[PDB]
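Quarterly update, task 2.4: calcium ion-bound model.
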Amino acid sequence: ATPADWRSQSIYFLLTDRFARTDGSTTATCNTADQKYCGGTWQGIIDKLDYIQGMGFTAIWITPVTAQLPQTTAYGDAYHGYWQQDIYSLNENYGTADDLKALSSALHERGMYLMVDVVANHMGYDGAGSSVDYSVFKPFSSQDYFHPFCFIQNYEDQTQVEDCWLGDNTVSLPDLDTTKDVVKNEWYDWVGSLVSNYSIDGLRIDTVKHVQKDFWPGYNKAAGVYCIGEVLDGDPAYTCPYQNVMDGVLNYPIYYPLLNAFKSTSGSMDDLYNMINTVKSDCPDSTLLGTFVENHDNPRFASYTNDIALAKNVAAFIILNDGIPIIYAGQEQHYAGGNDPANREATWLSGYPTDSELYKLIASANAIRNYAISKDTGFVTYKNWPIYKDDTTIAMRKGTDGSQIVTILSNKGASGDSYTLSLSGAGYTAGQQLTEVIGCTTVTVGSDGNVPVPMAGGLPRVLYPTEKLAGSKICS
Ligand SMILES: [Ca+2]
Ligand SMILES: [Ca+2]
């Protein structure tokens, strides 16, 4: 439930509707352009727990659970869960309050945490904000519970960004006035009981920049478990300060330079080394941010480049950076959907192969991370530090002196020449034996402390003291 506890977790983010069906189908059609319920359920999930778990994940984040407007709107169905009308009732398309129960239960039983996405900024309604029937919302049954109708025309304007409505003339999202002790009151109450009732460990919160700053603290205190919020802004100067009002925020400041460093063979490694330091110095606790390169609101990685060397590099950055690693369902199967709705593909259609290239990379990076933290209680709080950078390389170091992992990432791609990198600044002793745990090869520390790192095929390299791998299963 705890911030301090969520520090050692790694999350699999899935859209309930699109991860796993109850009949375990792997072929049922799911056309994204149609934007309708495809059929995923909470039972399908419980049924594919070994698939998540064998990638080394320790928790899953699932989309909102509240009862949605019922219509098929001009923009599709509420399959994503972000247009609620009734929060004391569940979206019957995913299952039953029992099902939601079993899942929290299968998870907990396997040592996993359950994170649930929640909305507080708004409701959803099929029509013009002007004709809304506030009598459908439960419990916000009067327009008196809502800011008056206006749409955000300028986002650089923060009071209108928080007080006007998101959405449009087609699908309107009635904006609550969270300023009133009533809105508040009910919202604090609800969050708290919801958590209790299904036993979830953390909350992912939507549209945080749309609610004025002051609502959150009590939101976060009432919930009683870790809250990570969505602040959709790339400026650390705008986003980080929310850390002053809730445990963590999603790493959007790192997202933009990370994508840009690995999306091309010419990506800038400077912008990323630089952003890694800025977030480390200016954000309250970089160790409580969530790292990500893909989600359902942005084109997937492989839409920008089909190179698997590059895909392999960004996946290993996210698992090994400071914070909670988050991988979006489909990333591991190299899905390449573009903007919404193309980036909400059903995971089942890949067949759920555990021998996929990104599946294996992800699994072997979660492996090391999971073990290091078994043996270095300082790892989750040691701040990642870029020790080196070149036009096609960056290398970082995290973990207590003596038990430190040194990751070497590169953007040379699936060609990328074969040459030796003499990496200085690792801080391993001379003559010490290191294991590259991705490829399970060994290298020996210099004499001068330099590590002759063998590079090829633009592959990521992750080093760790061979000695420290022991009663370890990492490379046998
Ligand atoms: Ca608002
Ligand atoms: Ca959102």
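Highlight for this quarter: The chain has two domains: 1-374, 375-476.
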